[PDB]
Design an enzyme around this catalytic site. Sequence first.
Site, PDB file in Angstrom:
ATOM      1  N   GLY A 105       0.980  -1.083  -0.257  1.00 32.16           N
ATOM      2  CA  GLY A 105      -0.127  -0.050  -0.034  1.00 32.16           C
ATOM      3  C   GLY A 105       0.915   1.191   0.054  1.00 32.16           C
ATOM      4  O   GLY A 105       1.703   1.542   1.148  1.00 32.16           O
ATOM      5  N   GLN A 114       6.183   2.992  -1.803  1.00 33.20           N
ATOM      6  CA  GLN A 114       7.528   4.199  -1.995  1.00 33.20           C
ATOM      7  C   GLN A 114       8.345   4.176  -1.326  1.00 33.20           C
ATOM      8  O   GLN A 114       9.198   5.211  -2.407  1.00 33.20           O
ATOM      9  CB  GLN A 114       6.361   5.311  -2.181  1.00 33.20           C
ATOM     10  N   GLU A 143      -5.525  -0.578  -4.973  1.00 34.47           N
ATOM     11  CA  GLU A 143      -5.543  -0.037  -6.391  1.00 34.47           C
ATOM     12  C   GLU A 143      -4.675   0.264  -6.946  1.00 34.47           C
ATOM     13  O   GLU A 143      -3.694  -0.588  -6.778  1.00 34.47           O
ATOM     14  CB  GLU A 143      -5.565   1.815  -5.859  1.00 34.47           C
ATOM     15  N   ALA A 169      -9.144   1.137  -0.894  1.00 32.08           N
ATOM     16  CA  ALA A 169      -9.104   0.574   0.767  1.00 32.08           C
ATOM     17  C   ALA A 169     -10.274   1.175   1.445  1.00 32.08           C
ATOM     18  O   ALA A 169     -10.044   1.616   2.852  1.00 32.08           O
ATOM     19  CB  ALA A 169      -8.076  -0.365   1.953  1.00 32.08           C
ATOM     20  N   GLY A 220      -4.239   5.084   7.249  1.00 33.99           N
ATOM     21  CA  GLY A 220      -4.461   4.578   5.751  1.00 33.99           C
ATOM     22  C   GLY A 220      -4.749   3.198   6.002  1.00 33.99           C
ATOM     23  O   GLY A 220      -4.631   2.021   6.801  1.00 33.99           O
ATOM     24  N   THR A 267      -3.304  12.247   5.213  1.00 34.30           N
ATOM     25  CA  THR A 267      -4.835  12.848   4.891  1.00 34.30           C
ATOM     26  C   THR A 267      -5.712  12.464   5.724  1.00 34.30           C
ATOM     27  O   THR A 267      -6.313  12.983   5.896  1.00 34.30           O
ATOM     28  CB  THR A 267      -4.618  11.152   3.423  1.00 34.30           C
ATOM     29  N   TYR A 289       6.994  13.911  -0.913  1.00 35.28           N
ATOM     30  CA  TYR A 289       6.722  12.314  -0.097  1.00 35.28           C
ATOM     31  C   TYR A 289       8.022  11.610  -0.710  1.00 35.28           C
ATOM     32  O   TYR A 289       9.126  10.924   0.518  1.00 35.28           O
ATOM     33  CB  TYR A 289       5.598  11.397  -0.532  1.00 35.28           C
ATOM     34  N   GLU A 324      20.220 -13.781  14.550  1.00 36.34           N
ATOM     35  CA  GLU A 324      21.117 -13.470  14.969  1.00 36.34           C
ATOM     36  C   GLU A 324      21.126 -11.483  15.183  1.00 36.34           C
ATOM     37  O   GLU A 324      21.718 -11.207  16.533  1.00 36.34           O
ATOM     38  CB  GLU A 324      22.620 -14.032  14.530  1.00 36.34           C
TER      39      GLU A 324
END
Lengths: 420, 419, 427, 428, 124
Positions: free
Chosen positions: D9, D14, D61, D89, D133, D169, D214, D244
């Site tokens: 997502g 990204q 999406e 979503a 989100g 958002t 972003y 480890e």
Amino acid sequence: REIVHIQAGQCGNQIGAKFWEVISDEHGIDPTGSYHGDSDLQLERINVYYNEATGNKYVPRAILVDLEPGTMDSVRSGPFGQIFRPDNFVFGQSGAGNNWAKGHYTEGAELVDSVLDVVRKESESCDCLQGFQLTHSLGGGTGSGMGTLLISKIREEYPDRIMNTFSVMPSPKVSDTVVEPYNATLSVHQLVENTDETYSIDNEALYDICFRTLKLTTPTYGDLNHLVSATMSGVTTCLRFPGQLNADLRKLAVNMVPFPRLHFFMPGFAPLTSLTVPELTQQMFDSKNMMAACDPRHGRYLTVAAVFRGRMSMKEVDEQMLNVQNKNSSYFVEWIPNNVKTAVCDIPPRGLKMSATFIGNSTAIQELFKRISEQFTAMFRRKAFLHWYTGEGMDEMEFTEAESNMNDLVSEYQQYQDAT
Amino acid sequence: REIVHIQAGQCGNQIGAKFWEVISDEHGIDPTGSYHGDSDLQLERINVYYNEATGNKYVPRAILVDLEPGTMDSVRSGPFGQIFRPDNFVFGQSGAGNNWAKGHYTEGAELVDSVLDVVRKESESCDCLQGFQLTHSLGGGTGSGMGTLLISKIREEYPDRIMNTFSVMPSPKVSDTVVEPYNATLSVHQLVENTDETYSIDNEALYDICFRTLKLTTPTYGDLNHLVSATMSGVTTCLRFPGQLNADLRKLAVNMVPFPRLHFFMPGFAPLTSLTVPELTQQMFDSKNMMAACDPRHGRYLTVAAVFRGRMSMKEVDEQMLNVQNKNSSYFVEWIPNNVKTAVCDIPPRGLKMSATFIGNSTAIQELFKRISEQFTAMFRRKAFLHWYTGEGMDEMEFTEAESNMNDLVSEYQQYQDA
Amino acid sequence: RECISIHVGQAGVQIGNACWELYCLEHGIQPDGQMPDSFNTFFSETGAGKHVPRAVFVDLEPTVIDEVRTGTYRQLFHPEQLITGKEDAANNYARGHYTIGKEIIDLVLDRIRKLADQCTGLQGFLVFHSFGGGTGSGFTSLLMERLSVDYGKKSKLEFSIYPAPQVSTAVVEPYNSILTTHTTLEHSDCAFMVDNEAIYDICRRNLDIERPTYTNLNRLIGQIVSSITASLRFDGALNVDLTEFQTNLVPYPRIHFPLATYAPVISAEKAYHEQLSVAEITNACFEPANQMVKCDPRHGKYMACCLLYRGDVVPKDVNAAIATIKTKRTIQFVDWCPTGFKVGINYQPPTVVPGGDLAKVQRAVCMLSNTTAIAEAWARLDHKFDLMYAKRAFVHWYVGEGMEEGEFSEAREDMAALEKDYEEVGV
Amino acid sequence: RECISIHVGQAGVQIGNACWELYCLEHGIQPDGQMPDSFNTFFSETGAGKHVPRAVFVDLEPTVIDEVRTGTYRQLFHPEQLITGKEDAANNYARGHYTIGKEIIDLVLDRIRKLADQCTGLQGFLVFHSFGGGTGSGFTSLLMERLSVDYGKKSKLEFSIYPAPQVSTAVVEPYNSILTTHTTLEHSDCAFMVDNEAIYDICRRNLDIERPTYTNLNRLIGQIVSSITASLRFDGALNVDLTEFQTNLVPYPRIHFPLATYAPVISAEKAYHEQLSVAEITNACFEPANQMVKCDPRHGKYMACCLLYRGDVVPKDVNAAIATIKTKRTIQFVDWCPTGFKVGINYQPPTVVPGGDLAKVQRAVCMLSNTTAIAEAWARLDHKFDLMYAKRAFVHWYVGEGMEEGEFSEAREDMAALEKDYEEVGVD
Amino acid sequence: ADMEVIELNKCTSGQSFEVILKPPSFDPSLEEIQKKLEAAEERRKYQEAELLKHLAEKREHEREVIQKAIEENNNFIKMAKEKLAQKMESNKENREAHLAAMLERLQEKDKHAEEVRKNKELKE
Ligand SMILES: Nc1nc2c(ncn2[C@@H]2O[C@H](COP(=O)(O)OP(=O)(O)OP(=O)(O)O)[C@@H](O)[C@H]2O)c(=O)[nH]1
Ligand SMILES: Nc1nc2c(ncn2[C@@H]2O[C@H](COP(=O)(O)OP(=O)(O)OP(=O)(O)O)[C@@H](O)[C@H]2O)c(=O)[nH]1
Ligand SMILES: Nc1nc2c(ncn2[C@@H]2O[C@H](COP(=O)(O)OP(=O)(O)O)[C@@H](O)[C@H]2O)c(=O)[nH]1
Ligand SMILES: Nc1nc2c(ncn2[C@@H]2O[C@H](COP(=O)(O)OP(=O)(O)O)[C@@H](O)[C@H]2O)c(=O)[nH]1
Ligand SMILES: [Mg+2]
């Protein structure tokens, strides 16, 4: 008369390989072949450490075990790599984990057989088999973890023969796992139950030796493995040279261990890095020159064995030795009479014209156990990383069982700073 | 991802047509054809509003409904008339009546199917259909009456997708039906039950804006529909442009509506008629500049969404926004945390170098409902024109049922001026 | 008549190895067995030509006995009479007596018995073994038990090597000493102790060997041992046969232990010096520095004396010499004896291993005395032993081979009783 | 041995998009896949020439994943490993976990499994997802359940993006965070939180970017994320297997959350300045302004420390540096540990995306610490969450996708228990 | 001195005699036991055959642990596999009624138009 060599786990193999390429130069063996050197003695007791194969060829009696390839291919593609027989190696493939439980139970018992299978066809191929010596780390997993299981499985297949371990009891400074004390305490328990002698090599000590007294700024596992290899070749000499006193492995044991439990020999060496006899003796008998971090002041000697090296007038040697244990008379226990034997062998080590090494069964060793145990109860108290072991199938109180067993061992070493 | 547009009834179509010829100039579409303009952005989200047909051609995704020809032929023979596909029009022929009952029951349900038949073949022709938006008047009959039924029939065919309405809540000043409050109350009931958001546009507001603050002496449905078209293009931008935040319709819904019932967004615009950023923010956040007649003093904000327009240094924009809700801190409700998001899109509207628009879920909206409801119990009290509806087949207590449902809605908005 | 030597375990083997070489040198027998009754008491005339020794050599590791069958004297013994056992005794009486001992004792006894079969009037055995050390203490003990079962009267003389710290391996040495000397006691007849410290000390004062070998010590012991057997090898009164030893030296079944003191020990290279008088070498015998278990007998009492002279010597001298030993010395005989001195003369002069450390001498003496001073060596041990056992020091190694902890208790209990006996023979 | 990345997502995609680009830059792999074991832990030599990443990209999406298959790196991944689901979503965990999630989870799991098949000793997964989100919280949760079913032992490390108001958002963000962090908890092994506010704040103080993208934030995260994987991507000292690596950080099955602090973040254009000392960058690590979850650790206690140096460095320095960090600072270790500092050195110097914001550096550090101060970010959430839920604020959107109201109750019940845990590891 | 050497024996290569010097002055080995040499093998054949049956103990614990981790990872799955699949037939079952309770609400307000249009054809 004939001992096999199990060498398991990263620290185990790194120590082991350097040990091998050190004695193969003492004895005079090629990367692959056999003899080249004008000395004569060597080959008499080469029987002990080299099961000799077809042609000339000597091939060391070694089992190389690890729970993942990495550090083994290290050895093959390196120093005297071409020396060990191919299917005397045992790759783990999987995770080693740096987790005792994994090496002793899950991912360990996975291998175990394949190892035993080679320890069998080496051992079942000895004229009169003395016993086994294993090298390995005590913290971390593949060596410390599978190793203790290996020895637990050897005694049983050979109750009979005696059990040797160079074990590297680990330290906060120079170390790589929060969990080491867990791994160590878990092993120290096992060692107490299944060995006949253990040479305690403190990585704490080693480090100090390089930076306390060597000007070595950054101690690698390199210029620190070196000290162990030298210490190990010294400690052995009589197993592999002229040989009348000690030298017979069981004879060494019957002489070094008064009490079934207390087999924790702290070693010590002559000059250092990578000498007059008196100075050689005042050095080899020095806190500042022991292989285990614990000053043999706070604690007396149960037995000492010292072994000198190089063409040297030994009129001075017993003379010197005798003095040591008069000067420092109080620190050798009164109730075991002639409790510090010495021997000489006149073939020097690498470089050095003169050298000596000393095995001490000392209650100063108590000092080391306490410190790994104080680390351990420091974590287990509010149960730290324990969940890594819980999950691997282990029991809560089994940690409590090891701690307690090893706490007894402190309480015994103490007990025998006694009286006549 | 793809919304269809139902546009029903005179006020519905008049608003709608101006809305359409406003965004087709924002996007850059010919009366019939497609692209002509040196901008590049536009077409990315033209997907949303224009089901594109053979050749180049763009054709808006629109259903045009009315219960008599007059105001539809208005649209065809006018502005961007040649743009909507022919059998996307639905003539009523009969009386509209200015009577909710007629549009919702008798003369309405007469049509309804023929409409649904086109909403189907538009919707059943989307890649992933977002939802519907309908524009219409709330007083009067063909829009207000058939519309509520249309939406009542859409949810059911599409429970699934979300429901949008620009509805024009009507006023004594500028109106000529005595019955509007009846027609409005009856619908306001329906809206509460079958939408996910409704943009409350007060013709009261509009009028005032032109005569309170515009010097416009005689406000037509002309220079007053204008304000709605501007407001509506503002409100939508993110549905149709860059795609930062909101832009999703459901996303807009999940963010704007705390409580299933209270979806009554009162809108507001930047400069006006037919600008510095601070001034732009002090204006877009002004009573005197709301699209619904109710000063957002008497009432707090549940959520705000604001959206700015034009190449402007947005370092100043959040800064500005942040200040607004600090200098006016008490009127944003404490219990919904980051409750006023903002976004920026750098393609200006017609004329204007700079613009902003704000959607506010405010309990000041309570003010509007009370006044349409005070009008309503004022008539129904001794049963005024009621006989017009009684006769069309309706029940007496169904009026009492709507009033009562909507009185609760006042009592809830009030309830959430809480703590 | 006859006489079987049994050498058990390294120390014993090597002491043996170094006196059979001397017996050979004394009797003109070349290493191959050839020589161009009498010395028949010790060698048998096997086949036509040879002269193999009446001896059995037993060790539990190969190694030492292996060296015997490798280097001249290789052909002296018969292949069988040299017995070896593959695994060690690893320095503990328990292993020796019980664990590894078991397996080999049926072959040894069965082989010794083949030599016994040869002997028309076998006279007894001479056992040579270490006090400390594993098979020396352990396996001997078991041998001596089973010997006393398989050969009733037949005497048993033992040559024990009493351990000394400087030339010694094991820390647990004392345990093994005390452990055996207990088990062995009611089975020996007379026992000649050899203090490795004394024999090492003689090598240092007398031979000037800076730090002596085992083979250095061994050659000296060879001489003292030859001096004892001499009597039974050449035949000439005074210990002509095992029984007489017991007869002359031991007054009480316990008290087995005579003190040996050997005459001129004088380093070859000094050989061409003036030869020492019969008086001077007799006097040597009464000088502790010349003894063979380090103790001090101008301290305890003599209950038997016995000068054994070798080489050319006349009684008129030995008599006249003994006179001045009494006058300017310590007589010191217990209450209830004569003031003995049984004198033996053997005209056959002493020989020496030609590459060796000591020179050819004209006349030697041997003075074997049962003095209560030997008791000192019994304490010096018991003291060590007590002082470890008080803590169980290494006991667990014995319990481990299946030995009772109370068997330590009980052996020390006997060593007390002996130390008691020895002191109770005064006044 | 092997290692599968999963990006779920937008945010996750990204962030991923921006460190696979960095992995590629680190290992000399050109965007087309071709490059003229080792880095094999992360890339599979497919066919003759190429070097495709062991990764799956999932969004509900198209849009974001669509941009990946459009612009260079287009040819890096295999077409299948990029999965997209047509409908959103819509910013709610319930939709993500149940409603639209349902449909795509069988395809995802079944594809991940194809990568799993090409791994001779697969070692674990690295999940990258947003806290707030919709699909980030929702779909991840469901993945992690079903992963824990389909891959037993196999570890699971997560890179969570902890939401911050300014670059965010949805209003219902908190619900989604608390909702997932609960469901996800007994299924993760160690989890690296990334506070979007901190990452944004670093970009403002340090890079001087007036208002960051972003992609501005992402490049920074890419670096912090590379610095973590680094250890097991080349072969560098310790942290050298996924067991480890974390056997180091987490003392208790819960307490997953290490605090990441990245060394010299210094804006390209300043590149030609004096290079910072090994002591100076070590010191950077103990400065909150440089952290990565906004909290304050001269407040809580340390129960694990772990300096991960990158570039040319000698232990003699790191040791001698650590000395003066203890002297003129706040040690602050809990009761029952060592005073750790596991040091790892990776001689391979740090690389930077050439058109990017930060300069080429000589030496960087990473200091991962399990401190009880992180708990602060767990309250700052819980506070939001309580204060809405106290009114059912948006609950009806979740009940609407068929979620129980008591499932909110119960997740918050856990976040309390955690906040409790974390405070109960102080003093003894 | 006062010698008195009483010569006991002369020989071919010897001569003994004793010189008494001063007056005196005063006036079952058993075979039985190797029922002890095999009773000591009884002690070993036993206490070694124990530090071997305390090893077949230590072993029956590896078998115990190795299959606990498997028995309780097996436990994680067939507990928290179906902890989900019965938490998804609570969701599916829930929302389905929420959509079909929102329809039996909605048809009911459309069977209203059918019952109030029929109100026109009976009141003209
Ligand atoms: N005088 C002398 N003493 C020796 C000789 N060899 C060993 N010893 C001593 O004998 C004792 C050790 O006895 P060993 O014969 O080695 O013990 P063993 O078990 O019989 O022999 P091994 O089978 O090799 O174990 C120590 O007290 C040493 O001092 C030797 O050749 N001459
Ligand atoms: N650091 C960082 N955070 C992001 C990025 N994209 C979104 N976020 C954050 O992620 C949270 C929202 O999650 P998203 O990934 O956007 O939503 P999603 O459900 O995963 O994807 P969608 O299908 O688009 O809804 C918010 O807190 C944002 O601040 C990004 O690219 N980098
Ligand atoms: N002497 C020395 N010690 C080492 C070496 N490698 C590891 N150690 C020590 O052993 C402990 C962990 O051992 P390790 O070999 O990783 O365990 P393994 O997984 O069994 O191989 C640490 O405390 C180290 O200090 C080595 O190369 N030389
Ligand atoms: N904003 C605006 N309001 C209108 C317009 N036309 C009518 N109205 C309002 O809507 C109400 C009646 O709307 P109308 O569309 O004629 O009802 P219809 O019979 O459904 O078409 C009145 O209260 C008017 O105030 C218009 O063109 N613009
Ligand atoms: Mg989403």
